[PDB]
Amino acid sequence: NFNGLKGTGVLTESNKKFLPFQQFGRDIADTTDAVRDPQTLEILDITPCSFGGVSVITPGTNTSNQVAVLYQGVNCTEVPVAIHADQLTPTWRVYSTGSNVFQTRAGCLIGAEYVNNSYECDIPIGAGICASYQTSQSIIAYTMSLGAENSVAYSNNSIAIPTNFTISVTTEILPVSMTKTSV
Amino acid sequence: KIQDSLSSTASALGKLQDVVNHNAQALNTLVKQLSSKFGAISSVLNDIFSRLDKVEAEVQIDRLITGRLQSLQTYVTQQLIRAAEIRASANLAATKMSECVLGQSKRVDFCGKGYHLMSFPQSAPHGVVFLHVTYVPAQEKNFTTAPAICHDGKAHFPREGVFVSNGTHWFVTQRNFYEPQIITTDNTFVSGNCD
Amino acid sequence: DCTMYICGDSTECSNLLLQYGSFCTQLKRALTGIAVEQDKNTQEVFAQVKQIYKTPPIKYFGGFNFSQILPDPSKPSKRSFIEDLLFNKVTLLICAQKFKGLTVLPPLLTDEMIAQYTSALLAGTITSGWTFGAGAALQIPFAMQMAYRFNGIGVTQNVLYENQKLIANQFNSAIGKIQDSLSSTASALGKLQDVVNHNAQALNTLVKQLSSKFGAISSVLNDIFSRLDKVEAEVQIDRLITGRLQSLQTYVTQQLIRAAEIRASANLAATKMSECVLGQSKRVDFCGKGYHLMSFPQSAPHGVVFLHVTYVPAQEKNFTTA
Numbered sequence: 001n002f003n004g005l006k007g008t009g010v011l012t013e014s015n016k017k018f019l020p021f022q023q024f025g026r027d028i029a030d031t032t033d034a035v036r037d038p039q040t041l042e043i044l045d046i047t048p049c050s051f052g053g054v055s056v057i058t059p060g061t062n063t064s065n066q067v068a069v070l071y072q073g074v075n076c077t078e079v080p081v082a083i084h085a086d087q088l089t090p091t092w093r094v095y096s097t098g099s100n101v102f103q104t105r106a107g108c109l110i111g112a113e114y115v116n117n118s119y120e121c122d123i124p125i126g127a128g129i130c131a132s133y134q135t136s137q138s139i140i141a142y143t144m145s146l147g148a149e150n151s152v153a154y155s156n157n158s159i160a161i162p163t164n165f166t167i168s169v170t171t172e173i174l175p176v177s178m179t180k181t182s183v
Numbered sequence: 184k185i186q187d188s189l190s191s192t193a194s195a196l197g198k199l200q201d202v203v204n205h206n207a208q209a210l211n212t213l214v215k216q217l218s219s220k221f222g223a224i225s226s227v228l229n230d231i232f233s234r235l236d237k238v239e240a241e242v243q244i245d246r247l248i249t250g251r252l253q254s255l256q257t258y259v260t261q262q263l264i265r266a267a268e269i270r271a272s273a274n275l276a277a278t279k280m281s282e283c284v285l286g287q288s289k290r291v292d293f294c295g296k297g298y299h300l301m302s303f304p305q306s307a308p309h310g311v312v313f314l315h316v317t318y319v320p321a322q323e324k325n326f327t328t329a330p331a332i333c334h335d336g337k338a339h340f341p342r343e344g345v346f347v348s349n350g351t352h353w354f355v356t357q358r359n360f361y362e363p364q365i366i367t368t369d370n371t372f373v374s375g376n377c378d
Numbered sequence: 379d380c381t382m383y384i385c386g387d388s389t390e391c392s393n394l395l396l397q398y399g400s401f402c403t404q405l406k407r408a409l410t411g412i413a414v415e416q417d418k419n420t421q422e423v424f425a426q427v428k429q430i431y432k433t434p435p436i437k438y439f440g441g442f443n444f445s446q447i448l449p450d451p452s453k454p455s456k457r458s459f460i461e462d463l464l465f466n467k468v469t470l471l472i473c474a475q476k477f478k479g480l481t482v483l484p485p486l487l488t489d490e491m492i493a494q495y496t497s498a499l500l501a502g503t504i505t506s507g508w509t510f511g512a513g514a515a516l517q518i519p520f521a522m523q524m525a526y527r528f529n530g531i532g533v534t535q536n537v538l539y540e541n542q543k544l545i546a547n548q549f550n551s552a553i554g555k556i557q558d559s560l561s562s563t564a565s566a567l568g569k570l571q572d573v574v575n576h577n578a579q580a581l582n583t584l585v586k587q588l589s590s591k592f593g594a595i596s597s598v599l600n601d602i603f604s605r606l607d608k609v610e611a612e613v614q615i616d617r618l619i620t621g622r623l624q625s626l627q628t629y630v631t632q633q634l635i636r637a638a639e640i641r642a643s644a645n646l647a648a649t650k651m652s653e654c655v656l657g658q659s660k661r662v663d664f665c666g667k668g669y670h671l672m673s674f675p676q677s678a679p680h681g682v683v684f685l686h687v688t689y690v691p692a693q694e695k696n697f698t699t700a
């Protein structure tokens with residue numbers, strides 16, 4: 001409640017050259033983020049506490065219920081700091097520092113063990129990472145494999161000609177209309 | 184085989200399933216929408232009349248009329264958007280029927296994977312399902328080829344097909360099927376010399 | 379994030395917002411459909427092949443020169459020399475002021491991974507002709523694959539061999555000028571520039587929008603309670619929660635309109651690359667002005683760039699016919 005203005009956040013000193021009169025720093029946000037404390041004569045810069053969006057990776061409910069949690073855009077060593085009573089809306093802070101945390105560009109996920117081979121994508125994550133429920137059982141994270149690597153031998157006087165063929169039938173589905181509604 | 188493929192997995196008809204899901208889903212969020220008080224005393228309509236004086240109950244009843252009225256516009260606007268993507272997908276289906284079914288399509292990878300032959304339509308709820316029949320080349324055997332041939336001091340080029348060799352002497356054959364034929368003047372034509 | 383953006387950091391926020399029903403969970407179900415779709419669009423344009431072919435070490439393609447589109451070993455990224463200009467000409471603390479719950483999720487396909495898909499299309503269209511898109515790949519010499527392309531135009535194959543040297547030099551001189559043409563003028567990439575500029579500008583209008591009062595005595599919810607009686611303070615915040623929520627609705631409806639146009643333009647690209655790249659097109663003025671010969675794809679930030687190769691007749695002479 002510096003200068004008779006309520007708010008919430010953490011406090012750090014900033015080097016912005018406040019003139020002998022100006023007391024508050026402001027930008028496009030237009031929500032107070034810097035206060036000159038009347039207690040002493042220093043400069044305080046306010047930023048909101050660390051936050052994020054919680055994403056849950058879950059396989060089929062009947063298959064299992066063990067889940068891997070992903071926090072977007074936060075340092076992986078920041079989430080252990082969150083483990084306190086009456087500091088988080090969730091109380092399931094047990095997953096904050098559990099199994100081997102793997103760091104990705106979109107934050108670091110917990111509860112999943114990172115293999116270094118490749119497979120096909122089962123549950124997308126972001127930045128080329130996918131997760132699945134493989135074998136006694138656990139959730140694993142890998143990197144997508146685009147496809148089987150192949151090479152074609154090119155020479156300037158050789159040609160390949162088929163000697164056989166095969167006939168295939170391929171299906172396709174297209175919507176055409178929908179229900180008519182009156183209100 | 185295609186009969187079993189549909190009956191094997193139930194995820195084949197996903198595109199025709201969410202069409203009815205989305206419209207049925209938007210109705211439910213519309214019925215539950217009137218439960219909100221919208222900042223008024225109560226969501227029930229007629230009771231607020233008998234509980235409050237008519238002089239200022241208009242203020243209370245106005246903030247609830249606008250709350251429900253705004254809900255309808257959001258629903259209608261959603262329908263216009265959804266009707267836009269369906270119509271943009273029915274024209275594609277109509278184009279497929281006029282080209283793939285009624286004729287043979289030269290547009291590569293438009294009416295199936297491979298070389299197109301002919302198709303069949305089948306009806307479905309809120310949609311249509313095609314059966315593209317295509318031609319896929321099988322295993323291949325490589326050879327040695329030369330662009331032209333010079334016999335009487337004049338270069339010869341194939342009429343249709345490409346010259347291939349098996350080691351002893353040359354042959355001419357189609358591009359898509361190995362049917363070797365003896366080199367002949369009927370299969371070639373002459374143009375210029377061979378230097 | 380509806381709870382944090384509207385009136386977040388207030389114990390009287392959620393309960394008052396709770397009685398409004400299922401509004402922001404309705405919006406939240408619309409901005410996830412856009413998120414999922416934007417990952418599917420890239421799967422239909424670039425991921426039309428499975429086997430990742432690799433170019434041979436030798437680069438003697440019958441006299442042609444392809445050094446300006448093939449992957450570059452020097453740079454750590456497998457990006458050709460044309461793509462380098464494209465990346466530098468798109469200018470992708472304003473990111474830090476998004477504490478109000480306006481995040482930016484990352485794309486599923488990383489930039490260095492799409493380049494592998496593009497490199498597979500090139501290496502499959504210069505050693506295997508066009509058959510790799512319609513069955514098993516079949517190798518063929520390049521000086522002989524071109525003669526197939528000239529046959530489709532209507533010009534007999536005997537003219538390519540007699541002019542192979544001239545055509546090779548003529549093609550090489552044409553690919554060089556593309557490199558300088560793109561850098562000389564900055565309006566070439568205006569199609570991609572506005573795609574990211576429009577989205578960035580829309581966010582700025584939304585964040586700046588919450589500073590309005592909407593008839594309330596003050597524009598801040600925290601200080602509106604210490605100066606007015608709590609019996610009817612609900613009235614003023616109601617004029618504020620409705621106005622704040624209403625503007626969130628406008629931004630979502632804008633994205634629905636824009637996503638429809640992008641999806642329309644994504645399918646057009648997905649159709650050009652299935653016909654102008656994996657085959658020859660007879661559709662006039664579809665894959666470039668003039669008679670079509672072949673096309674090569676190149677990647678770019680949020681988009682694709684083609685290099686159509688066309689055949690255009692030169693000077694003519696009058697004649698008398700019967």
Ligand SMILES: *[C@@H]1O[C@H](CO)[C@@H](O[C@@H]2O[C@H](CO)[C@@H](O[C@@H]3O[C@H](CO)[C@@H](O)[C@H](O)[C@@H]3O)[C@H](O)[C@H]2NC(C)=O)[C@H](O)[C@H]1NC(C)=O
Nearest residue numbers: 326327347348349350351352353354355362363364365366
């Ligand atoms: C490349 O293709 C040519 C053309 O088919 C092959 O030459 C032909 O090969 C067949 C099979 O060996 C010969 O038929 C046999 O010839 C013997 C000769 O005594 C005869 O006794 C048999 O009853 C039978 O007819 C055919 O004559 C021969 N043609 C010529 C002009 O030589 C050639 O063998 C093939 N090379 C390879 C490496 O596959």
Ligand SMILES: *[C@@H]1O[C@H](CO)[C@@H](O[C@@H]2O[C@H](CO)[C@@H](O)[C@H](O)[C@H]2NC(C)=O)[C@H](O)[C@H]1NC(C)=O
Nearest residue numbers: 162163164165166167168319320321322323361
């Ligand atoms: C071309 O491929 C077809 C199969 O796609 C071959 O047909 C098979 O031939 C074998 C020969 O022993 C038979 O036992 C199979 O019953 C045939 N399959 C079918 C579906 O008819 C055919 O033989 C191949 N062509 C050549 C020249 O070998």
Ligand SMILES: *[C@@H]1O[C@H](CO)[C@@H](O[C@@H]2O[C@H](CO)[C@@H](O)[C@H](O)[C@H]2NC(C)=O)[C@H](O)[C@H]1NC(C)=O
Nearest residue numbers: 437438439441442443444445446459550553554
């Ligand atoms: C294909 O074109 C490139 C572009 O010019 C050629 O690379 C040039 O090579 C010469 C030979 O020393 C250099 O002097 C030039 O500086 C190179 N160009 C650039 C832009 O660096 C390349 O040699 C050509 N391919 C072939 C087979 O000749």
Ligand SMILES: *[C@@H]1O[C@H](CO)[C@@H](O[C@@H]2O[C@H](CO)[C@@H](O)[C@H](O)[C@H]2NC(C)=O)[C@H](O)[C@H]1NC(C)=O
Nearest residue numbers: 668689690691692693694695696697698699700
């Ligand atoms: C010869 O070809 C030219 C076109 O290349 C015909 O047209 C002449 O050239 C230009 C193009 O129209 C005009 O400015 C001339 O006036 C044209 N000549 C005449 C006589 O009109 C030209 O007609 C052709 N010549 C013949 C005899 O058919």
Ligand SMILES: *[C@@H]1O[C@H](CO)[C@@H](O)[C@H](O)[C@H]1NC(C)=O
Nearest residue numbers: 058059060061062063064193
């Ligand atoms: C559980 O759900 C899976 C799909 O998620 C299904 O295959 C399985 O049959 C279900 N088991 C039940 C309902 O017992």
Ligand SMILES: *[C@@H]1O[C@H](CO)[C@@H](O)[C@H](O)[C@H]1NC(C)=O
Nearest residue numbers: 074075076077103104107108
């Ligand atoms: C955390 O911050 C440190 C700063 O030194 C950085 O090196 C590291 O990559 C960050 N990790 C994550 C997961 O953000």
Ligand SMILES: *[C@@H]1O[C@H](CO)[C@@H](O)[C@H](O)[C@H]1NC(C)=O
Nearest residue numbers: 100113114115116117118140
């Ligand atoms: C891959 O992971 C295994 C264990 O999962 C490890 O033994 C191996 O050294 C790793 N290979 C690397 C990191 O190249």
Ligand SMILES: *[C@@H]1O[C@H](CO)[C@@H](O)[C@H](O)[C@H]1NC(C)=O
Nearest residue numbers: 155156157436438440519521
């Ligand atoms: C094929 O390429 C090799 C390697 O450059 C060369 O020695 C040979 O002469 C070439 N042959 C033809 C027919 O182009």
